[PDB]
Amino acid sequence: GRAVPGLYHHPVPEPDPVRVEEVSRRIKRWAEDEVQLYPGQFDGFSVGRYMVGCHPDAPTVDHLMLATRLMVAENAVDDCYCESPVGLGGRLLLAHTAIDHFHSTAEYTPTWQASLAADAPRRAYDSAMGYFVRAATPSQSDRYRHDMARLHLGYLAEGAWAQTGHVPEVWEYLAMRQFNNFRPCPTITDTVGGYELPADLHARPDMQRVIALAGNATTIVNDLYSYTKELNSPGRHLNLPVVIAEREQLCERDAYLKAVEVHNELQHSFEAAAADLAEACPLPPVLRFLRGVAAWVDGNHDWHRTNTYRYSLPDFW
Amino acid sequence: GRAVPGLYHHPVPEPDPVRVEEVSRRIKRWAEDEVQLYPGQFDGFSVGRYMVGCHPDAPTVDHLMLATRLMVAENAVDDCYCESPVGLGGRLLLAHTAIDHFHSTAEYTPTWQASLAADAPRRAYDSAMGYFVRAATPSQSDRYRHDMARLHLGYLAEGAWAQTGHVPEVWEYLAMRQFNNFRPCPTITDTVGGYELPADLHARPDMQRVIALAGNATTIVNDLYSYTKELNSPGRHLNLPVVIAEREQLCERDAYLKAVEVHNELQHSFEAAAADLAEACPLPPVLRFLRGVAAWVDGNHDWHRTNTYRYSLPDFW
Ligand SMILES: CC(C)=CCC/C(C)=C/CSP(=O)(O)OP(=O)(O)O
Ligand SMILES: CC(C)=CCC/C(C)=C/CSP(=O)(O)OP(=O)(O)O
Ligand SMILES: [Mg+2]
Ligand SMILES: [Mg+2]
Ligand SMILES: [Mg+2]
Ligand SMILES: [Mg+2]
Numbered sequence: 095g096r097a098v099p100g101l102y103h104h105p106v107p108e109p110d111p112v113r114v115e116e117v118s119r120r121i122k123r124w125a126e127d128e129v130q131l132y133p134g135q136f137d138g139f140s141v142g143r144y145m146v147g148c149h150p151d152a153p154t155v156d157h158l159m160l161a162t163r164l165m166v167a168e169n170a171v172d173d174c175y176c177e178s179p180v181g182l183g184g185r186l187l188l189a190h191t192a193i194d195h196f197h198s199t200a201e202y203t204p205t206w207q208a209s210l211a212a213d214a215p216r217r218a219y220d221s222a223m224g225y226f227v228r229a230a231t232p233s234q235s236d237r238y239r240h241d242m243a244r245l246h247l248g249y250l251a252e253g254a255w256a257q258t259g260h261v262p263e264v265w266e267y268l269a270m271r272q273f274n275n276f277r278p279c280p281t282i283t284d285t286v287g288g289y290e291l292p293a294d295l296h297a298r299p300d301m302q303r304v305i306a307l308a309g310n311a312t313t314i315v316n317d318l319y320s321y322t323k324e325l326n327s328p329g330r331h332l333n334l335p336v337v338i339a340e341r342e343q344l345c346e347r348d349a350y351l352k353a354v355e356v357h358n359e360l361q362h363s364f365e366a367a368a369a370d371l372a373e374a375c376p377l378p379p380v381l382r383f384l385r386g387v388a389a390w391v392d393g394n395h396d397w398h399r400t401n402t403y404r405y406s407l408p409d410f411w
Numbered sequence: 412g413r414a415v416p417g418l419y420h421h422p423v424p425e426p427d428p429v430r431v432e433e434v435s436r437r438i439k440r441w442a443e444d445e446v447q448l449y450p451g452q453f454d455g456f457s458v459g460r461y462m463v464g465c466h467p468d469a470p471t472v473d474h475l476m477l478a479t480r481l482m483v484a485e486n487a488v489d490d491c492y493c494e495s496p497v498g499l500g501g502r503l504l505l506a507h508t509a510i511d512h513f514h515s516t517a518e519y520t521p522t523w524q525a526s527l528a529a530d531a532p533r534r535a536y537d538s539a540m541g542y543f544v545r546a547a548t549p550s551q552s553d554r555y556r557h558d559m560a561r562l563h564l565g566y567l568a569e570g571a572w573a574q575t576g577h578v579p580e581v582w583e584y585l586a587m588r589q590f591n592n593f594r595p596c597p598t599i600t601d602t603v604g605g606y607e608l609p610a611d612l613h614a615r616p617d618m619q620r621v622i623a624l625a626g627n628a629t630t631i632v633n634d635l636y637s638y639t640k641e642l643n644s645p646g647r648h649l650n651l652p653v654v655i656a657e658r659e660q661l662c663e664r665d666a667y668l669k670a671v672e673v674h675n676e677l678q679h680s681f682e683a684a685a686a687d688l689a690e691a692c693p694l695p696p697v698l699r700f701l702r703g704v705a706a707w708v709d710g711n712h713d714w715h716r717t718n719t720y721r722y723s724l725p726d727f728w
Contacts, residue, residue, distance in 0.1 A: 183500065183571030184579065184587070187564055191586050194561070197623040198589075199676045202582035209582075232614035236557070243560035244511070247504055250567050254500030262501065265519035265526075269508050270501070272515075293610035297549035306514040359516045 095400060098318050099411045100351070102358040103395045109146035116155045117142035121162050129217040131170060140401065141166060148279070148393030151287040151386060160226050161286050164238075165279060167218035168245070174215050176249050177328065178256035186246045192219035194239045230285040233293035241278035248274025256329055267337040268310070268356075276316070276394060277309035283386030284379065291383040300371050301380075305387065307364035312391040314357040319398040319405040321350060347410045364391070412717060415635050416728045417668070419675040420712045426463035433472045434459035438479050446534040448487060457718065458483060465596070465710030468604040468703060477543050478603050481555075482596060484535035485562070491532050493566050494645065495573035503563045509536035511556045547602040550610035558595035565591025573646055584654040585627070585673075593633070593711060594626035600703030601696065608700040617688050618697075622704065624681035629708040631674040636715040636722040638667060664727045681708070 097103060118138030125131040125138075145152075145162045152158045175185050188209060196206045210220040227235050251270040255262055262270065284291045295301060317333035324331040330340075334356060339349030368384045398405060414420060435455030442448040442455075462469075462479045469475045492502050505526060513523045527537040544552050568587040572579055579587065601608045612618060634650035641648040647657075651673060656666030685701045715722060 180497075180574050181571050181577065183564075183567035183569075184577070184583075185571075187568035187587055187590060188583060190564060191589075195623075196582075196586045196589055197620050197627065197680075198582065198585050199673055199680075201673075202585055205580070205582040206586060231611075232616060233611050236614040236619070240553070240557040240560060243557060243564055247500075247507060247560055247563055247567075250500035250564075251504035252500075254498050254502075257497050260498065260501070263522070265513075265515065265522040266501075266505060268515050268519055269513045269523060270504055272508075272513055273504060293614065294548075294550050297553040297610065299549060302553070303514050306512075310514065356516055356518075363514075363516075 095402065096407065097395075097399050098354060098407060100354050100358075101315070101318065101395075102361050103399075104392045106147060106389075106392045106396045107150075109143050113146045113155060113158065114139065114142040117145060117158050117162055120155065120159055121166060124159070124163055124221070125166065129167075129214065129221045131166070131214050131218055136166075140403070143400075144393070144397045147396055148390045149283065149286045149386075150389055150393075151283075151382075153288045157229075157286050157288060160229055161279065161282055163218070163222035163225060164282070167215070167222040168278070170218045171215040172249070174213065176253065178253045180257065182253045183250055186249060189215050189219060190242065190246055192216045193223050193242050226282075226285070230282075231290050233296075234282070234285045234290060237293070237296060238278060238282060241281050244273045245275065245278055248272075252332065255332070259329060261330070261332065261337060261340045264334070264337050264341055267332055267334065271313055271317075271334070272306055272310050275309045275313040276390075277305065277313075279394075280308060280312070280387045280390030281305055283390055284383050287382065287386055289379055289382060291379050295375065295377070295380055296383075298371075298375070300367065300374065304364065304367045304371055304384065307360055307367055308387045308391050311357055311360035311364050312394045314353065314360060315395050315398055318350070318353060318357060319401075319407070322406050322408050323404065346408070350408060350410055361391075412719065413724065414712075414716050415671060415724060417671050417675075418632070418635065418712075419678050420716075421709045423464060423706075423709045423713045424467075426460050430463045430472060430475065431456065431459040434462060434475050434479055437472065437476055438483060441476070441480055441538070442483065446484075446531065446538045448483070448531050448535055453483075457720070460717075461710070461714045464713055465707045466600065466603045466703075467706055467710075468600075468699075470605045474546075474603050474605060477546055478596065478599055480535070480539035480542060481599070484532070484539040485595070487535045488532040489566070491530065493570065495570045497574065499570045500567055503566060506532050506536060507559065507563055509533045510540050510559050543599075543602070547599075548607050550613075551599070551602045551607060554610070554613060555595060555599060558598050561590045562592065562595055565589075569649065572649070576646060578647070578649065578654060578657045581651070581654050581658055584649055584651065588630055588634075588651070589623055589627050592626045592630040593707075594622065594630075596711075597625060597629070597704045597707030598622055600707055601700050604699065604703055606696055606699060608696050612692065612694070612697055613700075615688075615692070617684065617691065621681065621684045621688055621701065624677055624684055625704045625708050628674055628677035628681050629711045631670065631677060632712050632715055635667070635670060635674060636718075636724070639723050639725050640721065663725070667725060667727055678708075 122138040145158050210216050334353040335350035339346050439455040462475050527533050638652050651670040652667035656663050
């Protein structure tokens with residue numbers, strides 16, 4: 095329950111247990127009844143607290159469920175596909191067509207259509223994206239598809255390196271982790287909050303830097319909380335402390351403490367860039383979106399800190 | 412110089428030789444002087460005719476050069492990286508950061524910055540995208556990055572299959588080819604034409620189907636013209652006739668003729684969907700963009716038909 099010592103973060107209120115329970119019951123029903131996700135590790139309570147904590151402005155549980163089904167589907171892919179298969183690029187492209195559809199001839203379209211029911215990851219993406227596309231504006235859907243293309247490219251860099259046991263330089267690992275990253279989750283904060291960050295404002299270079307820094311900081315949070323778990327993962331699973339240690343030839347402890355400082359610099363930079371843009375462009379949807387990304391990041395730190403079933407901390411302090 | 416018999420296409424005017432020559436001289440200078448592309452196969456005349464023919468509405472050669480440097484950079488990646496490396500996913504993600512930049516700490520940012528000069532593909536993307544970002548709106552830049560993420564995912568499906576000599580089902584091959592696809596070229600037709608298709612109109616589902624069908628048809632054109640060349644490529648290089656033949660157990664000839672019919676159905680569907688959207692949404696930028704995608708597709712068919720240095724036709728008629 096303790097935060098990583100020295101990790102810069104902001105406390106968050108206990109998530110509303112009425113919403114956590116309602117999310118938990120509905121996501122279990124979606125998993126079992128609509129997409130047949132499994133035949134435990136899956137808990138509804140875990141993801142319910144996660145999403146309530148990360149989206150305090152959601153008007154309804156229906157809004158929370160848009161993010162929740164997409165998070166569960168993302169998990170199902172990383173679980174069924176990403177553990178390192180040589181054939182990953184083919185599997186992931188076909189699953190990506192549940193997110194960005196295939197357009198083809200009368201002959202081939204139905205065969206693709208049938209593939210969307212073929213396994214749990216595609217049933218999960220097809221169904222989760224279908225609820226999102228109904229709720230969100232076409233620009234919000236397109237933005238999510240781009241963030242998912244980023245994430246799939248991220249997985250495929252990590253998998254290519256794992257095929258040869260390659261340890262990239264630290265900045266190379268960080269570049270992969272900018273893509274293989276929580277980013278598709280905080281960037282839907284506007285859809286989940288029932289409003290829209292207009293596309294031309296999303297596309298501003300300064301906003302794109304804000305989003306990347308937030309995703310980068312909050313993904314390094316996961317490196318830090320999941321570091322001890324990953325020591326048992328197959329092969330040598332990369333995370334920032336492992337890569338710094340191996341490339342910079344540092345003991346695990348000193349590498350882990352430097353990773354904490356890297357996280358802090360990213361989090362502070364995210365905050366300064368967000369403050370600058372809020373001043374440069376104080377339109378209400380921009381300010382709402384920036385606050386919502388911050389809330390997602392703080393909520394993601396809280397979930398990792400409290401999830402003692404998935405994570406524990408190394409003995410370094 | 413002859414078109415594939417039975418291939419549905421539209422003739423185009425001979426490209427303006429004054430513009431072809433000016434594009435040729437400037438792209439050779441960019442290649443040699445700015446990005447050190449090589450130490451022949453590269454001709455300026457080839458790509459000059461290509462881009463003039465595909466962008467008849469470009470106001471200036473500067474506009475044509477925005478597309479031309481990006482096409483040459485795309486080629487450089489496919490040439491230096493894609494021929495099948497196990498480490499492709501890592502190489503391509505790092506090159507993608509020349510298109511969608513890395514955001515990191517004061518320590519790691521400059522090391523990434525130096526990597527953008529490290530090889531010809533990254534110097535080519537960094538420089539070509541830098542001219543594009545200066546010219547285009549932030550929404551047009553963001554749209555190009557998404558189309559490049561699609562293309563890199565496409566390469567990585569093709570490379571994952573090539574690692575095991577896997578022949579996917581035909582619709583699976585077509586799904587990969589929807590991504591590994593000319594799409595990033597016709598979708599910049601508005602930037603090259605000096606106007607903007609507004610982002611919310613680009614994101615409409617019907618427009619996204621139009622774009623996918625156009626890219627799919629015009630990419631299958633390349634399968635058909637490059638079929639005889641690819642028979643000498645390493646391994647068994649996939650294209651629609653090869654995949655249909657191997658999965659459907661047809662002789663090469665009958666598979667090739669069916670591929671021509673598939674191309675035709677995609678091209679007709681593209682046209683019908685474009686006509687429907689022009690009627691549904693007759694705003695001038697939409698109608699300009701649809702005409703510009705059509706011109707790119709017709710120009711791409713013409714370039715393949717006339718490029719007897721890269722391509723020849725099989726003896727099937
Ligand atoms: C879009 C979503 C949910 C995730 C993006 C990929 C991602 C950041 C997964 C969480 S990080 P990962 O190291 O892979 O997972 P853990 O086992 O450490 O929990
Ligand atoms: C964005 C650009 C230029 C290309 C996208 C990838 C693409 C369609 C390359 C042309 S198809 P490809 O079979 O790879 O090349 P060819 O040797 O047949 O000429
Ligand atoms: Mg992972
Ligand atoms: Mg982890
Ligand atoms: Mg290729
Ligand atoms: Mg080809």
